[model samples]
Target chain A: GKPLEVIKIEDGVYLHTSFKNIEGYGLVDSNGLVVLDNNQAYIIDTPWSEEDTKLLLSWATDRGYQVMASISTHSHEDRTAGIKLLNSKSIPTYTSELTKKLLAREGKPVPTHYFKDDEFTLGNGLIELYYPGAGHTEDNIVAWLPKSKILFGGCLVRSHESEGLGYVGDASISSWADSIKNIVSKKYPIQMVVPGHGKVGSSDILDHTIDLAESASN
Target chain B: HKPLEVIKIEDGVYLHTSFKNIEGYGLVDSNGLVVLDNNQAYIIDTPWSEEDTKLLLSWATDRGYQVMASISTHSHEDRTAGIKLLNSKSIPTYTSELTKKLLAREGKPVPTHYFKDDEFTLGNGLIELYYPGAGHTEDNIVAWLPKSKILFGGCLVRSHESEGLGYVGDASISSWADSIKNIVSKKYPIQMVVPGHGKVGSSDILDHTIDLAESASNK
Candidate 1:
């Protein structure tokens, strides 16, 4: 089991990091967010492995936080590998109906619940799950924390350190560009932005992502 | 004065079909949806003309459902011809912001409110309006009722009964396929699909609309 690092990025929002190795990418760190509200925890994406998933859950339990709900940004292994573990523990796991369909089609564990809209709210509006068309995957969605103005871009957005768009095998490059454009046009009150990996920064992170998607698509 | 035809397609929802003698097209029928919840109702699209619109509204009123709002699916007369009457009766009218601009350019009766996004919800999610992209017109949109899984596909989609793409002056013929494709991507559990004109059919109508659009766009 890989040791997980959890950082409190906001009063009740924590970013957790776990590592996994891929053939091309070698060792990569996956980041997920745990939002704490009223002693209940809402998870956006799970750790890369069930072992890591268990470790993160224990860490939250030790702090007296009850795991309430979990949602995935996409069906990528890093985002969905822990779904089985969460569901086994009776936690309601969520994904867009599109993602759930894709997961089932790909022989992955489908989320227990599904959001049927392009934009969905959960944890009583603690976070907003928005599908900006398609990006890294056809069903990728971003998690937005409105009060904190922080966007958990997941793999749908790339970090500034990203050399190029990661993994285009399942990507929609052109709509990816349009997806970023959708975010820009929304004029969201974004003060902080968290990519799936790399550094967490501000709106400038979005600028770099838009820059990459635009140039790559063209 | 032609009487508008109404059918209770779903619980608390009615399909209002009205007729107009369109030049070159002969007698044409247009369809709109009226979604009622708890005695409050909202109409999607105007019914071809003011008389039809009034008849539709009166039908709702006599049923104890006050028509609170009317939504225009596009800038065409079939969609907006009854807007002036709706406004005079103090019923708030809505259209996509782009549709409103198009209406203003055409010197037509502009709607009272504009939805900025591709998706808009009314009556606290009772009714949802979604604009996929351009098909029948640059600003055409569809209305969906979540409870009934009914898609009021307006002109953006074609009915099985539609002989061909009805009008093209405001159409994006080349891009029409992509528009309806966006709707199907959402994968709504659409049980009933009501076209802007023609018969009310099941969700297969979406694929029918897509095939026609795809074939036309390719041609």
Candidate 2:
């Protein structure tokens, strides 16, 4: 298992880095988060590879935290790459039904569970997985952890440094801004936001993303 | 300046890696090429940052090659991000007129020279900068070095690993295949093909790209 650089964002929230080399984009590192409650850890996303996932899980076990299920915010390899590894280790993985369908179309492995509703509870926290519509990809979802006041915006949210919409090969241009606005309307007491690629920041990242998407779509 | 990973592909030809973090897509490393002839080098495309451009220029100087001019295949940041650096160093940059116009519209630094003709000569090589119609973007172009038998397809041509037409927000989907076919019809002795991203390969990449674009447009 490869070593992971874990950054503690809060008392029970951690950001884990998993580096991957993507075509068109080089060493685009992917990030996943770990949320802990009552000594039970639930992973919002897994690392990009089996080795990293194994390392992450081992790290959790070493800390005496019971590993719960994992959730993927989208169908992109950055978010769902470790689904096979999770399933192999008997860790249940969840994602949107559309994401599961999209992965199946790409012939990738599907997750263990598909979300039937917009929200679910994990470890005393209500995790709201909202489909704000299509932006980065049609099945992209944002996860709101009310207990932690952290929003895992995934690829749907852009970092402050992003010059424009990074990749739009699968984007629904016209619907992107509205989708982001929908998430902003919810106002989930978001204190911290984790984007799929770049730095984590405050909720202003969402507003910045909306601005970029609107300009691009127009 | 940041360190650049330069790979020598052939005699007087090198591929330089430039790092850029793009949103949605993470660290998308861009590639630029340097073609040298008689101690004068012509750069096709550029790294996506000022620091990387500086490193690349220094690398060229250390190698005793004078960069005569640089060229951008399109107006995308991946191709034109270093234009300001090039301009500041007193190195002239060239791109198609359409590319210059597009960059200007976006308030980006425009190149110093615009190619009025479809072809231009650089450093004893008959470099043909062809607007084979727009596939990747409205201003996209390809550089064909007939003397070296290498084609700089830029983002218009996809690598074998590419599943479909990528980042097509500005693509001319209906004409993408035809543009590739236009290049194919030229019958240049292309020994190596360099895409804007991914690996360098044979001319089959052009065909693979055409196939992908055809399938995607139909869908």
Candidate 3:
């Protein structure tokens, strides 16, 4: 396991590093944790490997904050596997109903809390979890922190460093493209965009992903 | 005013003879008989009835001929069911390779022998079986006999006005045009044409068939 890096995005919010041991790729994992007020934290995703999951758990405990809820970007082990471990400590995990149904079939341990279009106020602000449209998976949802301008968009958004092509199966190409358009149409001042699998970046990340999809169709 | 009827175009050419009267359609369901010089005969595109088969068999049998082969244009039972009866008389059946695959998939009747493209002589002339392309189905084939200037085109060719909103389903409006074009490019004098489901006419009927395919493809 690699040592984790904690970055302070604001006074209370912190991004914790989780490592996924991919062949030829360094210790960059696909997990992140957002620490809220009152020592209650929200974990964004889980790493691909069990070692990374243990490291993320350790990082959360060392910060003197208990993971109150684990919310995944989508329904994969890299995002959902750590939920079971966190739930053992009475920490509830939340995701869409469709994603729960898909994960159950894979025999993944179910989450304690299931949400459908809901908002939760944790620290000084509210986190809105909304499923825009079908992309990457039919039940993918993104966590929007309106006050901080930070969006934890799942596999729906991509990073430029991780190649241009995206996974297409299980995705509604037209609806997903439309959803991207709708997000852009909102003109949200998205300061930081954190995707499921790559380095975090700015609002321009969404436009780049949308353009990649449009060009690939040709 | 007369209902549709089948007629013998010549000594061995049987057509599903019909015409479109005001309230009905006019298509000549046609069949062909190739009488071999050795007194053996083969019929292509058998009618729907056993009675029709017997009558057609008698046409050549009375002329001291024996049925030796039964070739179907496609997989429709109306064009192929007479095979068992013909097989009882020790006659062989032939069709294209894809037709056999289609039969196996649909769990229908399978032909005993297949040819990618076949050419055989009977009655001192030769009949060439070529698959221009798959249209209505993946296995439809057209037969051309050069010496006699005759063409045996099955249901692929249509006559009369479009029926209702035109024939529905399974028929490819695209490949159908290419097939018609292929036949016309041959430019045979075409003394006579034996269509599986339409009245036999001059070679000019190819133009009408082309028009139908082109118009339907655009739609």
Candidate 4:
């Protein structure tokens, strides 16, 4: 189990990290956001390994926060690798039907719940999961915290430091730009944006992702 | 426009072919299924280029069959490259919402209708689209004709000559076998199985896909 790096991003929101060896992008790390609302916590995405996920769950449990549920933004291992651990602990997991199908095909344990719509509400409707479009993968989605004005773009939005679209094997090349455009066009009152694999920043991350997608498409 | 190679697969269903250049695998030909019921026709997938699509539409029109709609199994170009031509012809297109979103993101013409369910009926409930699960792509779906016991597995199910899983850059390596298993487990009484590429064959194609997916995952 790797050491979990927990960074407090806001009063009720925290970012957690778990490292994994990704092909083409070596030693890549993935981020999961923990939202604490009403003494209950919801995890968006999960660590790349079960060991790291156990540590994350323990950290939240030790702090007296009841982990209510977890949501995956896509079908990538970074987003769903820890689902088995969540399932074993009887923790409810949620994601798109496509994500669930993809995970099931990969022989991975799927979420407890599957959403068919483009958006779903979580934790008393404070947090929202939006499927802007397919950028990173067909199942990729974004998480929005309306109260905190933070958007966890998952792998759909790239970090400011990202020179290119990091991984595009499963990406919809022709539609990647439009997915980001949908996010920017929404005009969400987002103060901070956390990408799936890179540095967290402001709404500008959406534009950066769009730029990369457009360039790749051309 | 290049002449499309059309083959009659059944009483009213025809397989159409068009060539295209694909990344990783180049200059490959793709197949689309066209079903003509009554005076109206439904296309499952489309040719790889606009010119070939135009020819297909003209062929149907000349035969007094009105092309009603087209369906894309996934967001891949092989299945949806001719969508613009369909849009121009005012032909309605249907696909999974995820496929629509993916096409829209790529700046391609999208389907008019989107479905979320595992199965959807078309043309008097004779033709059905079934999403077995994610295989070649997250949005890939199979078309089934219950009356004929024919299944069009698209890219998710491989052809008889396929030595390995073809073009898995967008595929779910882990879940592919289960996806094929879901198709076989249904016991649809399928006599003919049409893959996205290569020659069509029997139910054994499903088992072959599973074998390839298992081998690839093990590797």
lDDT of 3 by residue, B118-200 (tens): 33333345566767675555567877767557788766665443231123244566788787777777676688776555356
Best model number under lDDT: 1
lDDT of 1 at B155: 78
Can you tell me the CAPRI class of model 3? incorrect
Best by DockQ: 2
lDDT, candidate 3, A90-195, per-residue tens: 8787777777777898788777777655344433565667777776667777777777788777678877576553455456665666667766665667898887
Model 3: how far residue A40 lies from native, Å: 1.9
**Residue B1, model 1: Cα distance from true site in angstroms:** 5.5
lDDT for each residue of candidate 2 in B155-219, tens digit (9 for 90 to 100)? 89988887767677677888899999989998988999998877899989999999988998898
Model 4 docking category: incorrect
Q: Could you tell me the lDDT of residue B155 within candidate 2?
A: 85
TM-score of each: 0.49, 0.55, 0.46, 0.49
Rank all candidate structures by their lDDT, best first, as comma-separated numbers: 1, 4, 2, 3
Model 2 chain B lowest lDDT segment of ten:
B20-29
Write candidate 4's Cα lDDT for B1-219 as tens digits: 235888898989899987642211123557888998888989998887778888889889999999999998998877887788788778988898889999889887888888988888888787888888887878789999887678988889888787767766677988888988887877889899988888889989988889888998898
The fraction of reference interface contacts (C-alpha pairs within 8 A across chains A and B) present in each candidate is 0.00, 0.37, 0.00, 0.00
* Residue range with the least summed lDDT across 10 consecutive positions in model 4 chain B: B20-29
Assess each prediction's global lDDT (C-alpha) against the native. 0.83, 0.81, 0.63, 0.82
Write candidate 2's Cα lDDT for A1-218 as tens digits. 12577889988889998764343533456677988876888888788777888898998999998888898887876655679888887888888888889988988989988876655555555577788888888888888888779899888888888667776767787899999999988878889889877899999998898898889877
User: Alpha-carbon error at B140 in model 4, in Å?
Assistant: 0.6
Select the stronger candidate by DockQ from 3 and 4. Answer: 4
